[PDB]
Every structure is written in structure tokens, then in C-alpha cells.
Subunit: 313 residues, 3 copies
């Protein structure tokens, strides 16, 4: 029961809604899902073919064994930490990739992650369009920014970006992507801090942003050990986000992975957060479709994450 | 069963005893307990009113919910958590003063705010012991934490050795030293397992006039040494005795996590001090609620055990 | 079940086998096992008499209580971090030792381990002989090298040594031993890396070694958090080791403290790994025999570890 992190009461009427909205990613170029099944997925990231666990890929693989057995890297093991197997000669920590004009690194760590969630291109497209068509310089806030591809998309489009992540290591990775992308001179502020602390302090300062993106994990830790738990804390976070939106704000975008909840729960939370603000809240799932070996052969849907987006419409 | 951490054999009579002794504080300073109940407590720390869990505060709160809700900071979660700041975001630290010593309250990911204000009773004993001493005194403060006792002793003119296994905690204590204006005071900062340090002091023939020790139920030395109060305390107290000066003024043991009785601490202390004369006083250290006005005595909240040997 | 870490299929005949081979050390010079029983052991390491837990010492102690009660240090256990008791007086962190001509430090940490496995002298003797009777300087690889006494034995004998350990702290200890042993100028290359990642990279580089020693724990962690689990990963490890043996290799030596397995399981793994390579695989247990107080007095066997050794013999 939420005692201390409740959203504040707002006046006015709930915004309009579009729900469910299923967003489906196209590859993308350097990424496609080749095949999946038996609790695994087979993905192409540029020159690297990778096998990773995907528990919900319950069905049987449709692409021949020979294609799976030609993978460059296979993630194995059971905390979250495991071991990559490299069955041929592909090796080192990193490899270059590009999505939506932004060059960044795929990276093998002890975790199953590869340094990008390429399905998020659908949201980066929304972001890029919003920045490049705005007739004024925009401020974009990116919370839980990870390897920073959204930050770089926004920076490349002309935004003044503030990227927030509690992990100094992840900030380092994002900065490496910034160099690779040729965006060293772009206005990106790198904030290594707990995300909710940063925004509450921004609220106290009276700071505002035109677009806020937020990608909270189910569980996290702030830079000074502050426990983050999505189901305990999200209502306060979104409330503070609204308090730091500019009068002419273009959007508030929430993405959520790996969570025992429907998009309807993100949706109704977002609708209530934005009570009296007008506009429209669109929510649902973000999915990838299998594309086969050639990348042109549509197959099954693999749902990755939830989203809810407010816009002034 | 304790096989390897037994105290040495002693001769003579057990010291005199005063037991139970209940030591009480009510916060006539930058601290008081406002209210408690339903497994929580409402406290004033200087400019901030804070709400923290207190599982043994089983009774019902006497101050209206509206007041608790109005707190500046609430500690939440299941040991790490998250502080909620309902009015507006608060900075990490805020200045406090107790017994003439200025130090920092601190919001960390834990429930601890950087001070145990009830310990002012033991600080007052210490302050008096040092002040009224004819001679310069050597004070050892084991498991010293944020070091308010170290600063009290330094301010009274003692030569202080502060021992804590945590470099982070030493850092906080040093920050307090600076804020308190005690940078030129003789405080030696030792980052080491406490029992290792005192056994090495014994080997060196070092002595101290006053020893305070605040061991946790479980801890870890600077180099991973496992500390467990019920396995190791008998040996620690025995070594403490071995490093007391001939004219020592006291040995003070404080113990949180109040599962064992003060009687156990008491019988162990008394036996450790066999043949040393003086008196062992033991019991609990408690805070009494003071209400919104700080002047309305309420319920007792017991925080810790203590046992103190003095030549008294 | 092993899906991703199988050794390649080999053709040809399994090497000859000698099994069980029980290797026994009675402790010379600075080490011997005085007595053991009641789940404890009483050992002399140079000038210190030490008591440590030894759960399999189920029998009774045969040396009087007085002698045990005169110990300089006793390890007392939460299980495996604990606390050393020094009953006579506080002991410093380290003390000088020497075995097989190599000077190194005994060390009190929060674990039961004193900085050397002196029973390993039997394998060090095999190694010393192999290096010092060779007609060329041998390349010796030592995986999971710990405090590096084997590395120092090989280097003293004239080998070019590569020492691999994921722990920077352990590498630091080994280097301290190198200094103490007077081997600072010797060709020892200190590698702080996951052992399997290092050897796969060696394989890619086409590198070879004349002798390979590997002492994998049941469970470990690479420098960059890679999970090591002997039962999941050892088959691939040994196969890569084979691929980095020189044509004129003198041996591949596996040691394992995972006592629960039989030496037969290390044996058959090593035999199959070396299929078609000729030579001989000898496997069994490495044991210490109690030496008692005075005279060299043969007592009970304390088995410490498993081993399997391939040689071209
Ligand atoms: C942890 S999530 C990982 C990706 C995706 N959102 C998911 O849940 O799988 C994205 C980023 O959030 C960061 N993070 C976790 N807790 C945080 C916190 N309390 N404040 C700021 N960033 C945090 C992580 O360091 C990471 O780079
Ligand atoms: C951990 S206790 C916490 C306060 C109070 N004594 C309690 O138990 O709740 C006080 C200090 O003991 C220190 N400490 C814990 N184990 C220690 C050890 N083995 N040696 C020296 N200091 C230790 C901690 O770093 C901390 O600052
Ligand atoms: C095997 S462990 C301890 C000694 C003995 N083998 C045992 O299991 O009890 C020996 C060394 O392996 C190292 N180690 C553990 N995991 C490793 C890894 N993944 N790669 C390289 N070294 C590792 C440790 O740092 C340690 O110094």
C-alpha cells in the first residue's frame, strides 16, 4: 500500500485516451530479429549474430538450426550475471552500430544486455520529429538514460539535453557513444544521480523541460544507494515530471520493461497524473516482429515493453 | 559455545553493582522525540521534523495524523530505503548541535541520521570526567561512528583515539570535527577492526584513561574480520581492561539491538572487572517523548543497553 | 546440461592412463601437518603453529591437548569469512615462509586460507624437474594462479611464466612474493583477467605454452564479472588449453579442490580432451600425511584435492 509516494490531487478532467496502441518496430538497418523460440531469440546487430534468452518466446524456432549454430555470441548462465560463449573468432568487448543516424557501441558485459534496446527506435522517431519540427530550441530530459541513444537522437536534432543515470559506468558508456556519434560539442548535460532526487531538486529550482522521457526499471539504486522500486515510487516520479514540464511542453513519455503489470496500469496512472492538463494519453505495448535471415520476411510478434505517452495534442 | 574468545582468569572480588539503572533523556537540545506509535517515531532534529520506523513503538500515537503527515522527511522502504521529502527536496546534510558540539545530520539510504542523541547521557559523564580531571586524559572511542563522543572528549581537552572500520564513517566524523572547530584538537583517526587495534595496543603496552565501546551485533573489520558481539565481546572487554591506565576513570559499553538483557552485559562486565574495585552500573538508556512543545513528558522509548565500570 | 561449453569432437585414441594415482606429501622444511581430528587440523607454517577447521578430519587427534592449546593462531569461522584468534599476542598480517627454494609470505586474511597450499609441492616438484631438465626455456602458463608459488618455482628454474588471476588483490600478493623471492627480474607476465577469456584470446593469437597448470575453483568471477562455474565451463577450458599447447609440450596439469567429484571425473574429462594426442593421463588425489611432533612420524592421510595430468611421456 502506497502511503508516502502518492500522486497529488489535481483539478479538472482526465485527458483524452488512445488505448491499446500497439507500436511495432521496423528494422532499423543494423538490427533485426532473425528468429525466436524455445525460450531464446536470435538477433542480428550489425556484423554480430547473437543468441540470448527470451523466456516468453515459447513457440518453436522456424529458421534452420544451421543459422542458429552460426551465431557469433551466445549469452549463457543464471545474479543477472552470466558468461558469453563465442563459438568462433568474434571476441572483444564492443562493436560499432548505428540506428536512426546515431552511431553507438554494442557491448558484451557479464549481463545479457547488449547496450541498446533497438525497438525503442519507435520512440526515438517520435522524439526526433518533435525536436526537428519545433520552431524553438527545446529542452529534453532523459531519465534512466542508460547508454544514451535517445539522448543522442535528441542532441543530433538540435535539443539541449539533460541525461540522468545513477550509474557512473553507464554514463561513461553513453559518453563513449557521444564521441562515436560525433556529438562531443552538442549540449548534453550528464547527470550521475538518482533520477527522482534529480527531478525533485529541479522542481525546487523551478527548472522546466519541453520533453521528458523516463525508462524506470522495476528495481534500481540511486548514486547514493537510494532504493528505487517502480511500483512504490512511480506515482511520485510522474507527478514531479508534470511539475517540471514547460507551459509549451510537447510530451511526457514513460517506458517500462519487465514488470508484472498491463499497459492499462501505466495508462491509467499517466491519465490521472495529467488530469486537467488537456491533450491525449496513448498507451500500449512496444513490439518487434521477426524479420528472418534476410530481414524481409515478417514472422511472429515479440512484445518488449509497455509505454504511455502524454502530448498536448 | 565460546571456545576461543574467553577472558583471562582473574583474582579478587567482583566490583560493587548498581543494577538495573535506567538512564533517561528528554531532548532539551536540537533533539526531542515528539511522538511515537504504530511502529513509527516522530522526531525533531534541529530545523527538520522526521518520521522513522521504530518497530517496538507498538502503542498508538498521541499526536494527530495531520502533524505526522506534515514532517519534512520520512524514511521509507524495507536495511536500505528511500527518504521522502513531502514539502520540497532536502539537501543531504543539515547542521545540528548537542552538548556544545556542532555536527551534521545526514540523509543516507539508511534509517540512521548520523547521531544517536540519547547517548548525550554518556557524553555528559565523559565531558565531566575529562573536565574535572587534574591531568590530561587519553580517551579511546571504539566503533566511533560519526564521532560525537570523540568531539565531546576533544572539546573537554582529552587526547582522543577514534576507531572505526569504515573509511566512509571516518570521513563523516572528520567532517563533524571541522564543523565543530576541532581541527587543531588531538584526535587520532584509526580505520581498523576495533578488536585488532586494541589487541595491538595491548602488545604495544598502550594505555587509556577512558574507553568507550559501541559494538554492533554484527560488523566487519577494515580487512573483512568478522565481528559478532556474542562471539567476541568477552575477549574485547578483557583486552579493554588490559589497556586501561592505573588511574583509569571508566570503561563504558553501549549495545544496540536489545534482544539480550542488560543483565547479561552487566554480569560479563562485572566478571571482566574482577579484583579491579569500583562499581559496575548497568541497565537501559531511554528517550522520553516530549510532545510538540518539547515540555510534555510522555512514553518511554528504550534505545540501548549499557554497562559502565568506574573506580567510583 | 552442457549446451554451449562442450569441447570439440576429436578423432583418434584416448591416451594411456594411470589411475588412481595417490600423490602424497609429508611436509618438509616450513610446513607440516602436526595432528588433526574432531573437525580441526594443527599445522606448522614456519614459526607459527596454526589451528584451522577441516571438516573431513572426522577421526580423533593423537597429539596431547597442551600442544593444540599452544597454537599461535586459530581460525574461527562463521562458516567462509571469520576471525583469527591470536592467543599469545596480536600477530601481524604476514610472516616469511619458504618451500622448494622459493621465499613467500604466509598471510592472515578474513578467510581460512594462509596464502599457500603446501601440499601442491608435489606438483611444484614435477614442474621444477620438467623446467630444469628441458633443453630450452619452457613457456609455462599458470591459470587461477593465486599467490603464485608455482609461478615462482617455474621462474626460478628458468621458465618464461604467464600468471593469470582475475583478482587484482591476489596479483598484488603474488608480486609481493616475487619481490621476496628475489625474482623481480625474472620473465613473469602478470595477467589480471578472467582465465577462460585470456586463454581463448591466446588461442586466437595462435599462442602456445610448453606447460599449462590450471587450478579452477568450483565457483569464481572474472575481472569483469564473468561467472565461472567448474562444472559448466571446465570442458571448454581444457579444450582451449589443448589448442594452446606447443607441439613439444611437456604437460597439462589440472588441480581441483571440488572434492565432491571423483578424481575419475577429472580423469575421464582430461582423457577425452587429449583424444588423439598420445601420451598418458595420470589422475587421483593429492594428500598430506600427518607428521606428528618430533621425528618424521607417519600418521593419517588428509586428502586435499584432485588432480589429473597429461604428459607426452
Ligand atoms: C536500469 S534501467 C535498464 C533498462 C530498462 N529500463 C530495464 O528496466 O530493463 C536503465 C538505467 O536506469 C539506471 N538506474 C537504475 N536505478 C536508477 C536510479 N534510481 N536513478 C537513476 N538511474 C537509475 C541504470 O543505471 C540503467 O542505466
Ligand atoms: C556499526 S555500529 C552502528 C551504531 C550502533 N552501535 C548500532 O549497533 O546500531 C557503529 C560503528 O561500528 C563500526 N564497526 C562495525 N564493525 C566494526 C569492526 N569490526 N571494527 C571497528 N568498527 C566497526 C561501523 O562502521 C559503525 O560506524
Ligand atoms: C581456485 S581459487 C582458490 C584456490 C583453490 N583453487 C580453491 O578452489 O580452493 C584460485 C584463484 O582463482 C582465482 N579466480 C577465481 N575465478 C577466476 C576467474 N574466473 N578467472 C581467473 N581467476 C579466477 C581467485 O582469485 C584465486 O586467487
Amino acid at each position: 500500500e502506497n502511503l508516502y509516494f502518492q500522486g497529488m490531487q489535481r483539478t479538472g478532467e482526465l485527458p483524452a485516451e488512445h488505448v491499446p496502441v500497439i507500436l511495432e518496430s521496423s528494422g532499423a538497418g543494423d538490427f533485426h530479429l532473425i528468429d525466436s523460440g524455445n525460450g531464446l531469440k536470435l538477433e542480428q546487430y550489425g556484423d554480430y549474430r547473437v543468441v540470448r534468452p527470451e523466456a516468453q518466446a515459447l513457440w518453436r524456432p522456424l529458421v534452420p538450426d544451421r543459422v542458429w549454430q552460426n551465431a557469433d555470441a551466445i549469452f549463457t548462465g543464471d545474479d543477472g550475471m552470466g558468461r558469453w560463449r563465442f563459438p568462433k573468432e568474434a571476441l572483444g568487448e564492443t562493436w560499432p552500430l548505428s540506428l536512426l543516424g546515431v552511431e553507438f557501441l554494442g557491448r558484451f558485459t557479464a549481463f545479457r544486455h547488449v547496450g541498446v534496446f533497438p525497438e525503442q527506435i519507435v520512440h526515438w522517431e517520435w522524439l526526433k520529429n518533435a525536436v526537428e519540427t519545433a520552431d524553438r530550441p527545446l529542452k529534453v530530459l532523459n531519465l534512466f538514460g542508460y547508454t544514451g541513444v535517445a539522448s543522442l537522437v535528441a542532441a543530433a536534432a538540435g535539443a539541449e539535453v539533460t541525461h540522468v543515470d545513477a550509474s557512473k559506468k553507464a554514463i561513461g558508456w553513453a559518453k563513449e557513444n557521444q564521441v562515436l556519434a560525433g556529438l562531443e560539442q552538442a549540449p548534453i548535460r550528464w547527470i550521475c544521480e538518482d533520477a527522482m532526487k534529480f527531478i525533485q531538486r529541479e522542481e525546487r529550482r523551478g527548472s522546466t523541460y519541453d520533453i521528458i522521457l523516463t525508462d524506470p526499471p522495476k528495481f534500481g539504486r540511486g548514486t547514493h544507494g537510494e532504493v528505487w522500486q517502480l511500483f512504490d515510487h512511480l506515482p511520485l516520479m510522474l507527478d514531479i515530471c508534470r511539475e517540471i514540464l514547460s507551459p509549451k511542453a510537447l510530451g511526457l513519455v514513460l517506458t517500462a520493461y519487465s514488470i508484472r503489470a498491463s499497459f492499462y496500469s501505466m495508462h491509467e496512472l499517466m491519465r490521472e497524473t495529467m488530469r486537467g492538463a488537456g491533450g491525449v494519453v496513448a498507451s500500449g505495448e512496444l513490439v518487434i516482429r521477426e524479420a528472418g535471415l534476410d530481414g524481409k520476411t515478417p514472422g511472429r510478434v515479440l512484445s518488449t515493453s509497455l509505454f504511455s505517452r502524454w502530448e498536448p495534442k
